[PDB]
Design an enzyme around this catalytic site. Structure first.
Site, PDB file in Angstrom:
ATOM      1  N   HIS A  42       0.809  -1.230   0.000  1.00 55.65           N
ATOM      2  CA  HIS A  42       0.000   0.000   0.000  1.00 55.65           C
ATOM      3  C   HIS A  42       0.847   1.287   0.000  1.00 55.65           C
ATOM      4  O   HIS A  42       0.356   2.356  -0.382  1.00 55.65           O
ATOM      5  CB  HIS A  42      -1.009   0.007   1.166  1.00 55.65           C
ATOM      6  CG  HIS A  42      -0.448   0.504   2.460  1.00 55.65           C
ATOM      7  ND1 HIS A  42       0.037  -0.344   3.432  1.00 55.65           N
ATOM      8  CD2 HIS A  42      -0.306   1.759   2.951  1.00 55.65           C
ATOM      9  CE1 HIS A  42       0.471   0.367   4.455  1.00 55.65           C
ATOM     10  NE2 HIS A  42       0.269   1.646   4.194  1.00 55.65           N
ATOM     11  N   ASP A  88      -0.524  -7.318   2.308  1.00 54.07           N
ATOM     12  CA  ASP A  88       0.072  -5.994   2.284  1.00 54.07           C
ATOM     13  C   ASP A  88       1.591  -6.135   2.362  1.00 54.07           C
ATOM     14  O   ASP A  88       2.198  -5.992   3.434  1.00 54.07           O
ATOM     15  CB  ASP A  88      -0.492  -5.133   3.421  1.00 54.07           C
ATOM     16  CG  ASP A  88      -0.162  -3.657   3.255  1.00 54.07           C
ATOM     17  OD1 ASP A  88       0.274  -3.272   2.152  1.00 54.07           O
ATOM     18  OD2 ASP A  88      -0.322  -2.891   4.232  1.00 54.07           O
ATOM     19  N   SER A 185       4.083   2.967   8.359  1.00 58.24           N
ATOM     20  CA  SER A 185       3.696   1.873   7.463  1.00 58.24           C
ATOM     21  C   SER A 185       4.828   1.459   6.524  1.00 58.24           C
ATOM     22  O   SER A 185       5.571   2.305   6.018  1.00 58.24           O
ATOM     23  CB  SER A 185       2.477   2.254   6.623  1.00 58.24           C
ATOM     24  OG  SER A 185       1.438   2.764   7.430  1.00 58.24           O
ATOM     25  N   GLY A 186       4.933   0.152   6.290  1.00 57.06           N
ATOM     26  CA  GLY A 186       6.010  -0.433   5.499  1.00 57.06           C
ATOM     27  C   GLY A 186       7.233  -0.814   6.301  1.00 57.06           C
ATOM     28  O   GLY A 186       8.062  -1.592   5.841  1.00 57.06           O
TER      29      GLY A 186
END
Ligand SMILES: O=C(Nc1ccc(-n2ccccc2=O)cn1)[C@H]1C[C@](O)(c2ccc(F)cc2F)CN1C(=O)Nc1ccc(Cl)cc1
Ligand SMILES: [Ca+2]
Lengths: 234, 50
Positions: A42, A88, A185-186
């Protein structure tokens, strides 16, 4: 990261930062090897073109130990969708190899069964990044880290407004104001075992940050070990 | 076996023929004692001192 502590020198060397054409961090990543970075699928929608910075702990100033790498190949899991946030996961092949040094080193990829029986049954994991230090705040200038308890799977299905798939797991706190957040995120969720840190999760999503009755949601790396291995060879 | 303190392995533990077999992530080699993992600098999963 809401709460937690600053990563001190050498403490979080597998942290990567994805930066936009404005050289601004928008997502995290994990160093897997000299050529490969682990991140979230994402994150790939959050920037037209981007690069990866390693060795950074304070984005305000360029100290000397930082290095920026352009991305050669982006490998996004072909089953990711914004609808579910399932699968994800992405892997990036870099154009030039990372030089390992102080604050630059990879986290270990574990084996699936051992990871599930030994790492994920641990009390806690560690999440890190440059994301917001509060829900409505600005992106963090300093690299932070936070110990997050593993959360009972039923406990966090009950807590979630969205479906928690078997490719996800929950970590963090019910009411304590500590969590990952947007901009993290990530990035890495790693689990410590005898002073060696293994990658166990990718920061994925949450409802807000540090909310009462809500947990942080991470991609389960153990569900993708074969996919990661394949991505790093083919 | 592997249920008892990770079979005394540093890293990965498998039970083969009801006996412990230890192994290590990439960039480590299994020590002579068949339990410790020896870095082959900047091995994966170690915080950096220099
Ligand atoms: O994108 C966000 N949230 C988000 C995204 C997708 C889904 N989601 C999940 C499953 C299926 C569909 C879906 O949209 C849920 N939350 C942002 C905005 C966010 O919800 C948010 C809300 C209100 C705010 F005022 C500020 C925010 F940043 C927080 N987000 C976030 O990612 N938080 C987070 C991520 C990882 C971890 Cl470990 C902890 C917290
Ligand atoms: Ca800097």
């Amino acid at each position: 990261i809401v709460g937690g502590q600053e990563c001190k020198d050498g403490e979080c060397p597998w942290q990567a930062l994805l930066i936009n054409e404005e050289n601004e961090g928008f997502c995290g990543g994990t160093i897997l090897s000299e050529f490969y970075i682990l991140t979230a699928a994402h994150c790939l929608y959050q920037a037209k073109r981007f690069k990866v910075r390693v060795g950074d702990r304070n984005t305000e100033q360029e100290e000397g130990g930082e290095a920026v790498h352009e991305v050669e190949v982006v490998i996004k899991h072909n089953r990711f969708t914004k609808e579910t946030y399932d699968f994800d996961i992405a892997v990036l092949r870099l154009k030039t190899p990372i030089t390992f040094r102080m604050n630059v080193a990879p986290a270990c990829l574990p084996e699936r069964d051992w990871a599930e029986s030994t790492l994920m049954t641990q009390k806690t994991g560690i999440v890190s990044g440059f994301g917001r230090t509060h829900e409505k705040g600005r992106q963090s200038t300093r690299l932070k880290m936070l110990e997050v308890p593993y959360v009972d799977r039923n406990s966090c299905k009950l807590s979630s407004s969205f479906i928690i798939t078997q490719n996800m797991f929950c970590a963090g706190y019910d009411t304590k104001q500590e969590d990952a957040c947007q901009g993290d995120s990530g990035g890495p969720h790693v689990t410590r075992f005898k002073d060696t840190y293994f990658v166990t999760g990718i920061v994925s999503w949450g409802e807000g940050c540090a909310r009462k009755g809500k947990y942080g949601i991470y991609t389960k790396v153990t569900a993708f070990l074969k996919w990661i291995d394949r991505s790093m060879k083919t | 076996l592997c249920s008892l303190d990770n079979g005394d392995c540093d890293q990965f533990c498998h039970e083969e023929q009801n006996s412990v077999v230890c192994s290590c992530a990439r960039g480590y080699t299994l020590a002579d004692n068949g339990k410790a993992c020896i870095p082959t600098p900047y091995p994966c999963g170690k915080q950096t001192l220099e």
